[PDB]
From Swiss-Prot, chains A, B:
Subunit annotation: Homodimer.
Positions bound to (indol-3-yl)acetate: V49, N110, L112, Y143, I337, V338
Tissue-specificity statement: Predominantly expressed at the lateral side of shoot endodermis cells as well as root pericycle and columella cells.
Keyword Cytoplasm: no
Top-level taxon: Eukaryota
Source taxonomy: Eukaryota, Viridiplantae, Streptophyta, Embryophyta, Tracheophyta
Coiled-coil parts of chain: none
UniProt membrane topology term: Multi-pass membrane protein
Entry keyword annotation includes Phosphoprotein: yes
Protein name: Auxin efflux carrier component 3
Family annotation (PANTHER family): AUXIN EFFLUX CARRIER COMPONENT 1B-RELATED, AUXIN EFFLUX CARRIER COMPONENT 3
Membrane-spanning ranges: 6-26, 37-57, 70-90, 100-120, 130-150, 238-258, 262-282, 297-317, 323-343, 357-377
Pfam families the UniProt entry points to: Mem_trans
Listed result of changing L112A: Strongly reduced auxin (e.g. IAA) efflux carrier activity
Length: 377, 377
């Protein structure tokens, strides 16, 4: 039908209009400097997106979630992680960094900003509720798992670099409150002291055998905790979830004054997010960075494997009707911004993630419309 | 009543919440740098406020304006300008810069951003329509008159500095397209050539007798035109007015796609404007700049003379009922941002205007509520 296509275009075009206004402001008319661009982008990340997340999560009933949809979204990632573990351990070509990159490319799309409007336009509001559930699960669990993997990689690198042979003896790790992460952008001294028992205790402070799993688990937990409490999305998600539980349990309503105080800043969310994406597009040198073959492989993964694995998982679970179409089209979305931020922070194939986010945002309208049409027959 | 006070507080508090969030981000938690602050502020000025103006103006019917309200708002400024001309010409203590500053302090409040919500909360939506009419008149006429006065001052200064004695002979001025203003921040050479007729022609190019009024008028018109076409508010106001005329004449409706493309960026307007005001508050060194006595005089002017002159003009015109209260409370609003921008640009008592905007924004809630209560009896 043509009315459906017009409705999808009406929903989706203004986001691209904002994106291209930002792109032209930086590129054609030169209205903003790189520092002003960074200021706008930091405002977006700190305030606008987290408040949008609080607005969406705090309004969705957590007692009425769909269990089969959650199970399918979980089984996709379980399948991918099982395949990646098999490949990484039983194939000499395997590696942890490529496993993380493939998992992010194939499992974690942009769901909050453009997913909800696009899916509401395509299928209705209940699709918006399903996308909100997906957002909650990504924010609480899978982003946390990404933090765990990145911190484990950093800790392994530090331990190998510092204690090539003594890594088996160490039993205790002490991290001073100054340290906040193990990205490798800080000068991390590592003192070693011999205890009365004859073992070695380690203190990591800001300036091939591994230790037993217990001390590694303790260290990873400490560092994940330290990064988790400095994350605006953590507070937004947790406070929104707790408020939703209390409100839908006791039917409590927020006072109008607090609600308006939140809304006045939440209303800028979608527009400022699209503007920030346009700024990111304008700041980079080339629209394609990784290259022709690598970009082709990344796009193929994102737009075929994710949908295919989702199809297999959804058929195995027993999804049918329009839930299956929603799941597939959601899996065919462009790649999310949070994994791209993590790739920047830890420098793990950031160019592929950049190509994903930007180029897939550009080409998702035709690809997603093709999925819509083929599934709609 | 207490319900009315609660409603006004509900309408007004979230603006202050956004302002204080920006203030704390810059001052207490140090989230933004001065350059990032400038980027956010420039985004606000270029995009958010102009699109908010287009949204408000393009939706207000220009065939149903109130003529007595317009006449009262015009007569206030006519009275003030007559008094200032008398004082400036017939008193040795008079001056043009002080006349401009007093006119701005006593006539031109912040009407677009906080005036419309506050007045709608106090009196209803029709008050919002009246405030929209006031916004239109300020944007088209009085801001243009301020530009004329500032450019006349700049031209007089340039002519006196360059041609102390020959200013009477010159008959023709040529300004090269490179020049855009006469603020004094540019190195403006002034070539003089003798014509065959024996008169002197002048070319002002980027690097006590006045000339006849005709050449001065021509020069002022050229420069006012050059600054008028580089002003986002000019385009927003003119296009909104033309669209409103056409739409309310032929009942044409904008297509949903264009309307949403505008709205996605207009929705950030009020919140980003309050955030920018908070940033301006945080960036300055002292909340009071001009001093105790000068600040007292400026506040007294803003919050007593404007209301008093408006009362006299509204009684003379014949305003009664609630229109009179609306006019007085509108006159008691804090000082507008555009005259403050002009004072920055031309360096004409900018500190007094800064105190006006910021401190009056802080203290307008009690003062304006006092006006509300006293008029409400
Ligand atoms: O990665 C995502 O897109 C995502 C998915 C589900 C829930 C939240 C997010 C999320 O934080 N987005 C963003 C974070 C920071 C900056 C962003 C700028 C633009 C768009 C999304 C952003
Ligand atoms: O001066 C005013 O407040 C005004 C009055 C009527 C119509 C428009 C305006 C106006 O452009 N405001 C502003 C311009 C530029 C930046 C601003 C930032 C914050 C608030 C208002 C702003």
């Amino acid at each position: 039908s043509w009315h459906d296509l017009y409705t999808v275009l009406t929903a989706v075009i203004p986001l691209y209009v904002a994106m291209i206004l930002a792109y032209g402001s930086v590129r054609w008319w030169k209205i903003f400097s790189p520092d002003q661009c960074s200021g706008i982008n930091r405002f977006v990340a700190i305030f606008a997106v987290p408040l949008l997340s609080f607005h969406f999560i705090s309004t969705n009933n957590p007692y009425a979630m769909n269990l089969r949809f959650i199970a399918a979204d979980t089984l996709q990632k379980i399948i991918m992680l099982s395949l990646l573990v098999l490949w990484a351990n039983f194939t000499r070509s395997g590696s942890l960094e490529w496993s993380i990159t493939i998992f992010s490319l194939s499992t974690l799309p942009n769901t909050l900003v453009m997913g909800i409007p696009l899916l509401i336009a395509m299928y209705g509001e209940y699709s918006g509720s399903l996308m909100v559930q997906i957002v909650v699960l990504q924010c609480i669990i899978w982003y946390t798992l990404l933090l765990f993997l990145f911190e484990f990689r950093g800790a392994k690198m530090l331990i190998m670099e510092q204690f090539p042979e003594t890594a088996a003896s160490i039993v205790s790790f002490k991290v001073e409150s100054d340290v906040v992460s193990l990205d490798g952008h800080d000068f991390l001294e590592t003192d070693a002291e011999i205890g009365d028992d004859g073992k070695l205790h380690v203190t990591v402070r800001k300036s091939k055998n591994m230790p037993p799993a217990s001390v590694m688990t303790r260290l990873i937990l400490i560092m994940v905790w330290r990064k988790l409490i400095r994350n605006p999305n953590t507070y937004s998600s947790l406070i929104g979830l707790i408020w939703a539980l209390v409100a839908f349990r006791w039917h409590v309503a927020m006072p109008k004054i607090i609600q308006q105080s939140i809304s006045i800043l939440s209303d800028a969310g979608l527009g400022m997010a699209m503007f920030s994406l346009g700024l990111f597009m304008a700041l980079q040198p080339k629209l394609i960075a990784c290259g022709n073959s690598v970009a082709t492989f990344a796009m193929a993964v994102r737009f075929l494997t994710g949908p295919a694995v989702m199809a297999v998982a959804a058929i195995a679970i027993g999804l049918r009707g329009d839930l299956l179409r929603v799941a597939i089209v959601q899996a065919a979305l462009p790649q999310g911004i949070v994994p791209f931020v993590f790739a920047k922070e830890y420098n793990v194939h950031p160019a592929i993630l950049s190509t994903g986010v930007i180029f897939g945002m550009l080409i998702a309208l035709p690809i997603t419309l093709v999925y819509y049409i083929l599934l709609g027959l």
